[PDB]
C-alpha cells in the first residue's frame, strides 16, 4: 500500500525538519555558554551584597 513519490515527500520533509531542528539546538547551545558570560558578570555584585548585608545585631 501507499505511494512512492508520496514517500519521498515525507523523507525530504522530515530531513528539512531535522535540519531546522538541529540548527536551533546548536543555536541554543550557543546561548548557554553566553548565559555564564552574563552569569559570571553578575557574580561579583552578588558577593558584595551579602557581604554588606552581613546584618547588624
Amino acid at each position: 500500500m501507499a505511494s512512492l513519490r508520496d514517500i519521498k515527500t515525507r523523507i525530504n520533509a522530515t530531513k528539512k525538519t531535522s535540519q531546522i531542528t538541529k540548527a536551533m539546538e546548536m543555536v541554543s547551545t550557543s546561548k548557554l555558554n553566553r548565559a555564564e558570560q552574563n552569569a559570571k558578570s553578575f557574580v561579583p555584585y552578588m558577593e558584595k551584597i551579602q557581604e554588606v548585608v552581613a546584618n547588624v545585631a
Binding site: 501507499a2 505511494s3 513519490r5 508520496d6
Partner: protein, 124 residues
Amino acid sequence: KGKHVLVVYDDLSKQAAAYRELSLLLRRPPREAYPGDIFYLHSRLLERAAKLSDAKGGGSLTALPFVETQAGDISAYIPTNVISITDGQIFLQSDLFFGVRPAINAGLSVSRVGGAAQIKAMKK
C-alpha cells in the same frame, strides 16, 4: 439541433477497467495492463462535447466525467489521462468532509474555461 445538453459520465474508471478486460480477452498486447489505446478511449469521447458555432445553432454538450482514485493518488494512470483531457477538474478529498463539506479541494481544483463561464455578476 440547437438545444443544450449535460452528460454525466459516472465513473469512467470502470469503463477503462472494463475495456481493459475486453482488450485483454482479445489478447491485445498490453502500461498497467491497460491497452496502448486506453488514452484514445476517453479522448475521442470527451472531445464530442463542445460549443457548436452560431453557424450551427449554438448547441452544446457539457461533460461531467468521474474517476475513482485509490488512496487519492492523482498520479495514477487513468487519472492523468482523463485530466490531460478535460478542461479543468474538481478534486474531492475525503481528507476534508471528515471541515469544509462538499469536499472540494480549492487547491488542486481548476477550471480552464473559467471566468468566461461566470456572468458579469459573478465575474466582478
